[PDB]
Design a protein around this ligand. Sequence first.
Ligand SMILES: Nc1ncnc2c1ncn2[C@@H]1O[C@H](COP(=O)(O)OP(=O)(O)O)[C@@H](O)[C@H]1O
Lengths: 78, 439
Amino acid sequence: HDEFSEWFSKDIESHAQSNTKLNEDQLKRLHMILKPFMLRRVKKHVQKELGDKIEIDVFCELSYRQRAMYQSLRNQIS
Amino acid sequence: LIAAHSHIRGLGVDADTLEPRPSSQGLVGQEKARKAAAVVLEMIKQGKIAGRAVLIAGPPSTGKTAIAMGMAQSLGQDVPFTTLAASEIFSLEMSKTEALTQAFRKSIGVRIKEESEIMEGEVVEIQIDRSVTGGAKQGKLTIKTTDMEAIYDMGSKMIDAMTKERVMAGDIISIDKSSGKITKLGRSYARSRDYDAMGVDTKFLQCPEGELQKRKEVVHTVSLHEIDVINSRTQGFLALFSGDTGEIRSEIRDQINTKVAEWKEEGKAEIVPGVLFIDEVHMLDIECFSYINRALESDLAPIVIMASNRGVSRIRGTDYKSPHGLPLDFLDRVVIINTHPYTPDELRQILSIRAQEEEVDLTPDALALLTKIGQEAGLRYASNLITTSQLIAAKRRAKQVGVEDVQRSFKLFYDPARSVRFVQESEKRLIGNDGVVDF
Ligand SMILES: Nc1ncnc2c1ncn2[C@@H]1O[C@H](COP(=O)(O)OP(=O)(O)O)[C@@H](O)[C@H]1O
């Protein structure tokens, strides 16, 4: 795992590849690693019994007093 | 009925260019002042610019109040429009300045929005428990729509409304839960044949469907003066109708202005700025102008439109003259719109509009003679001649009025131009500033 400190450099470019998914250095090596060490049973095996779940995203605003205290906090960071 | 400004149906300008149409919506025969009043109307409907002063100056009988009523009909029943006359301010109850302050604050509407909860359905049973010789009351109301069957409770005010309404079994009532009014809509059964003093068989309505507790969002518009009176007195409400408001101190206004600003920021209320029309402002004395010039300095001042008649007149309460009777420290603030006297080809169509409004049919010779009279005596004599000639033609059983009816009305009722000569002829049998004799 301290060789995975060099792969912790990979782990910070894992944020950079969350931006840019076009690298393959550890993933096939993890396919070598994760044929042991892990055993995945999927949601698809279990949700086929169940129905569906759907997230609905609802935005909001700030009231005058609320935005006033929020930029009072921005004056506080000022 | 048919008053002197019932034919007017607005100001009569365009919506995109606001050019003055020569004949549109009653106000027919003038172009400059109607275009300027359209500009004033547009900056009132914008609502942003606060504290101006518009002075509609000109000769009498030239349609100044007609332009004011044209703006009044053009705003509709949304924006307040106070038709204040300048002599109402001189009270004996309250001070002369506070009457002006109330006249400004009556023209700033506050439009609030609140949720009430209305009910609907058929009353199944009433259950009222009453004490003996004074005491509380208890109430259980079973109400049923086509779906729900509820057994509600009642307090003292609800029973005092039920007994006032006489809500029996089998009535379609709707109770506002917040305000607490009861409006019977009708019945579903028929009238019983067991009691005598029952009442009148109402409208036959079926059982309402849906739900019991429905919500409603109502919009209430109060002027700032009503807020001042309901927040200036502990129990003495209703004095905003019977005029019994003595004085409102400044500590009350400086709190209500701040709370209305807070209601504006919270999205609770919306400030609708309005119009204060002051008819014949030349009657106000200088003690009024020394406050009117400074009340137009805040965010809660209405856009004042006001009329005048006078030339170089002396200001009341002073010793010196000025144009329009208004002081020259107040005439800097105002903006003066002139009106012009009319032309006979415009008096013809104005009398035509006034004749078609009062349902009077004419002959063109009578209309020509009427225009000839209106050239020399103004509209205020000619319209009276129209109505009078209508009734004289009704007396002699004629369909349309004629030349003879107009000559009859001109012979009977003098215009002021002949009454001045009638004064100046017989000066010995009229009380001047001196004695009088009797033959
Ligand atoms: N341009 C006009 N269009 C329609 N009616 C008019 C016009 N000018 C005057 N009148 C009529 O003449 C009468 C006098 O107008 P008003 O505004 O009362 O005169 P004043 O401004 O002297 O009080 C009003 O009843 C109005 O109906």
